[PDB]
Design a protein around this ligand. Structure first.
Ligand SMILES: [Mn+2]
Ligand SMILES: [Mn+2]
Lengths: 112, 128
């Protein structure tokens, strides 16, 4: 799906969707899409299935098209019904003016 | 209270609490305590009473001591039963390893931040 759509969802849309950053944790921390949850791909299914309803609208993005498509396949094979890639990932999001948040403590995050 | 207590609630406790940054919106965006909701004093009680259950454990911090205790007292006079000041604010929080969160057109971000806040577990409890 297109970055312009997700940006609209975040500015004006119904609350019911989640953005999943599927890259490395530290990478997420250095910078991620505003609102995205850190679900590194190594434990994506386990983590998503224990935290997200299968009917929830989910947008996924990783470091590149390959990682993103892999994350998307995983979640669906796990029973998730509304998952889509975020074409262009982070880069495409910045290009259209989308905000990026960064963290500056792994125990707070895991315990979380 | 002390930033040490909050650091422990996050490292070891329950997610039975909410953190409120009562400073200027731009300052918040440049850096706030991780997980903090943006609630400028100017709009604090209106935004909180319509977003949080008054029995919710709340930690508040502003620019300095005076603004912080001013915020605490406002929420309390408004009925919030478990409000605590986060003495030392952002700086006190960093001095001890507290991780920060920062944003990187003024309306766009605020519009998004509000939608993400309304989607927070506790705000959803106050609504359900
Ligand atoms: Mn974030
Ligand atoms: Mn002001």
């Amino acid at each position: 799906s297109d970055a312009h759509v997700l940006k609209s969802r975040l500015e004006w849309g119904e609350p019911a969707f989640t953005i999943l950053d599927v890259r490395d944790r530290s990478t997420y921390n250095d910078g991620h899409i505003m609102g995205a949850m850190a679900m590194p791909i190594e434990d994506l299914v386990d983590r998503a299935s224990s935290s997200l309803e299968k009917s929830r609208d989910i947008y996924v993005y990783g470091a590149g098209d390959e990682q993103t498509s892999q994350a998307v396949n995983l979640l669906r094979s796990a029973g998730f019904e509304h998952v889509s890639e975020l074409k262009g990932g982070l880069a495409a999001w910045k290009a259209i003016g989308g905000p990026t948040e960064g963290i500056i403590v792994s125990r707070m995050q895991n315990h979380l």
